[PDB]
Symmetry: C2
Subunit: 247 residues, 2 copies
């Protein structure tokens, strides 16, 4: 089985693929305090409750935006799995044609998401990833990664305000402060996504399918039709594709 | 003449009204370091270059969200103008019917803006104020302040990202990082405003005129039709109305 790890500033998502299918996934807060042995012990527990052992895992790929924890995760992989993981970084092969002027500044997971999205959903595509930032990538009808749009993420924008559950209020016009802020975050974000996506489609030669991922993709897609498919595991699936290409 | 002062966390706007009309306005960064005498000396200079003296000013009203500078501004008014200013606060009379459940938690300038907007533009109204936060207030067809919507302000959201000039990029799909972020802030914000305003109008009995104010109102209104009137001096005009009612 192949173990994938997508580590964010705030959250990590783990998954195990068996015969090219996602067997199980797990989500957690990124912990800069945790040691290689405490990662190994937590992973042991996740595997055990899934009916798996370390031995079941034959390959590992990690994508991370947190250098201060890479050393420990790599050491945990080497110690518990006896495997040196593949790290998504400069010089990993992806098969992705990047026409963006800044290919090296493209987030690793935008690349991963584009590889998965094109393989799973075709082209042209708009990919919306609601994470720490909300990104919108545009892949053209020749499967070229053209670039896109970056905005503040739902939680980071909600924190800068409330300074948290993204709840639907009983009305848009908030009859009270909490209600006004709930409306603002939710409907403001929906309006943001609708507006950007409509403008990106306007610039497009062929009309693209819109796919979204990230924890809060579902909330947004419940409120709008602008998103065609929510795929919560796009990045995991992409990292699995990358592992296979690079094995 | 009547001197008005609207002091924000980040910016202050001053104005002088002569025969009920705004004669001149001045904008500046709020300075927590400045003393009462350095405020008096700066005001002296602004008046001189306008052809005015301290003596010309017979009344003063101040609205402020920065308590640490009120003492100095009040002392400057008392010393240079020989006037104790009216302060927008609990117990100032406004003539505004507030149906919002949290009347006391309504920003002073939302009240000021509503008083000015209703007097100058009628009802029902949607008032959009692009400041530190972007607020959307809804006044119903009986001129009642119903509440509204609060979102992160253009600059605070742009800072949390870039961490600045809000520029129109050459395309929505940014061909490069800076371009992607420019698109995101600008078109994301436009989409946010369009979406919220359309939802607020949907809840409205009569169809409201939409008025906007704040430094960046013009940028947004250039990009959308959702705003009927940009009135850059709504708050100044409101504070003038409040001074007159309370004199």
């Amino acid at each position: 089985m192949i173990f994938v790890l997508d580590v964010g500033n705030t959250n990590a998502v783990l998954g195990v693929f068996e015969e090219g299918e996602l067997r199980q996934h797990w989500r957690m807060e990124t912990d800069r305090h945790k040691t290689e042995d405490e990662y190994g012990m937590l992973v042991k527990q996740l595997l055990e409750h899934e009916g798996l052992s370390f031995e079941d895992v034959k390959g590992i790929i990690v994508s991370s935006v947190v250098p201060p924890i890479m050393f420990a995760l790599e050491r945990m992989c080497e110690k518990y799995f006896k495997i040196k993981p593949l790290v998504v970084g400069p010089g990993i092969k992806t098969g992705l044609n990047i026409k963006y002027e800044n290919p090296r500044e493209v987030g690793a997971d935008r690349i991963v998401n584009a590889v998965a999205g094109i393989h799973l959903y075709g082209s042209p595509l708009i990919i919306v990833d609601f994470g720490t930032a909300t990104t919108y990538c545009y892949i053209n009808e020749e499967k070229h990664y053209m670039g896109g749009v970056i905005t503040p993420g739902i939680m980071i924008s909600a924190e800068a305000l409330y300074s948290i559950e993204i709840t639907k209020p009983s009305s848009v016009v908030g009859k009270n402060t909490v209600s006004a802020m709930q409306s603002g975050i939710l409907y403001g974000y929906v309006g943001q996504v609708e507006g950007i996506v409509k403008r990106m489609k306007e610039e497009a030669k062929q009309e693209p399918k819109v796919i979204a991922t990230g924890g809060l993709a579902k909330l947004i897609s419940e409120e709008s039709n602008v998103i065609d498919v929510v795929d919560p595991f796009l990045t995991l699936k992409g990292l699995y594709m990358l592992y296979e290409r690079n094995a």
